[PDB]
A paper describes a structure:
On the other hand, U2AF small subunit, U2AF1, binds to the 3′ side of the boundary sequence between the exon and intron, known as the 3′ splice site (3′SS). Then, the recognition of 3′SS by U2AF1 is a critical step for the determination of the excluded intron for the production of mature mRNA. U2AF1 consists of conserved three domains, an N-terminal zinc finger (ZF1), a U2AF homology motif (UHM), and a C-terminal zinc finger (ZF2).
One of the hot spot for such mutations is Ser34 in U2AF1; replacement of Ser34 with Tyr or Phe residues induces aberrant splicing. This mutant was chosen because its solubility is higher than that of S34F mutant, making it more likely to find suitable crystallization conditions. Although the 5′-AAGGU and 5′-CAGGU complexes did not crystallize, the crystal structure of the complex between the S34Y mutant and 5′-UAGGU was determined. In the complex, O4-carbonyl oxygen of −3U maintains a hydrogen bond with the amide proton of the mutated residue (Tyr34), despite a small but distinct position shift of the uridine base compared to that in wild-type U2AF1. Along with the imidazole ring of His29, the aromatic ring of Tyr34 also stacks against the −3U base, forming a π–π interaction that is absent from the wild-type complex. In contrast to wild-type U2AF1, therefore, the S34Y and S34F mutants show little discrimination for the base at −3 position, except for rejecting guanosine. The S34F/Y mutations clearly allow much greater flexibility in the selection of splice sites with U, C, or A at the −3 position.
Residue numbers in the entry:
A (entry chain A): 2 to 193
B (entry chain B): 106 to 161
Write the structure that this text describes.
RNA sequence: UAGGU
């Protein structure tokens, strides 16, 4: 009795795609009959199919577990550093799915909405790993409502074809060194 | 003003961390184009259809 | 047109 109930962006909302409202990518894409509302102002950007996991290649079944961890850290390091030139980065998530709408997707949430707009304006003209970069604003705000719950604990029984984000987390050493490195870069540009 | 004080309060705690704009990336794959595409821009490559997304 | 309010 304190507030009116609603079903916006929910799985019970049958005119808006709930999966695009929370995850930022739907399995049907442009052919979905439910609404995909693309924001004009957003803090989160999307780079679809940017992380090519070597495990899903014809010859990438030769690396050990330690070599795989350093390779993924080399990718996350290369991602976080480049996105930091467009402003402050609050969170960076990399999806390890195989579905055509979420495989290797890279989500970046900036602190300011103008920082996100300047990022997609420049990324759409750049390259990465011999491939053109696709960039767009994504309606994702809270990653907890988009991550797979049964994947954080143990593994999801749906495997790589899960429609929720199977985020591949990096090493804690790299994540800590990146947040501290960004704070110094922001402090050194504030002293003027 | 306390802003300049708080700024030079955190820089000293970060005396032995490299700022992110300096970090030397050994093999960064940014701006690396496929062979022959040195004159092709990224926008022309997407419209050409040779680089489609997995959804299409 | 789903498993996630
Ligand atoms: Zn949809
Ligand atoms: Zn899952």
């Amino acid at each position: 009795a304190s507030h009116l109930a609603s079903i916006y962006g929910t799985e019970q909302d049958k005119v808006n795609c709930s999966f695009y409202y929370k995850i930022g990518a739907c399995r049907h894409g442009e052919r979905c009959y439910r609404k995909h509302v693309k924001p004009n102002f957003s803090q989160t950007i999307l780079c679809p199919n940017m992380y090519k996991n070597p495990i899903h290649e014809p010859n990438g079944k030769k690396f050990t577990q330690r070599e795989l961890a350093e390779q993924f850290d080399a990718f996350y390091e290369d991602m976080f550093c480049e996105f930091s030139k467009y402003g402050e980065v609050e969170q960076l998530v990399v999806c390890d799915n195989v579905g055509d709408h979420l495989v290797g997707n890279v989500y970046v949430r900036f602190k300011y909405e103008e920082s996100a707009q300047n990022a997609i304006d420049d990324l759409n003209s750049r390259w990465y790993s011999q491939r053109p970069v696709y960039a767009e604003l994504s309606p994702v705000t809270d990653f907890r409502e988009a991550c797979c719950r049964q994947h954080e604990t143990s593994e999801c029984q749906r495997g790589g074809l899960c429609n929720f984000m199977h985020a591949k987390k990096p090493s804690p050493q790299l994540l800590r060194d990146l947040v501290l490195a960004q704070r110094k870069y922001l402090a050194l540009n504030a002293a003027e | 003003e306390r802003s300049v004080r708080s700024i030079e309060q955190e820089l000293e705690q970060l005396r032995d961390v490299t700022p992110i704009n300096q970090w030397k990336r050994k093999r960064s794959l940014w701006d690396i184009k496929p062979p022959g595409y040195e004159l092709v821009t990224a926008d022309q490559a997407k419209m050409s259809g040779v680089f489609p997304l997995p959804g299409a």
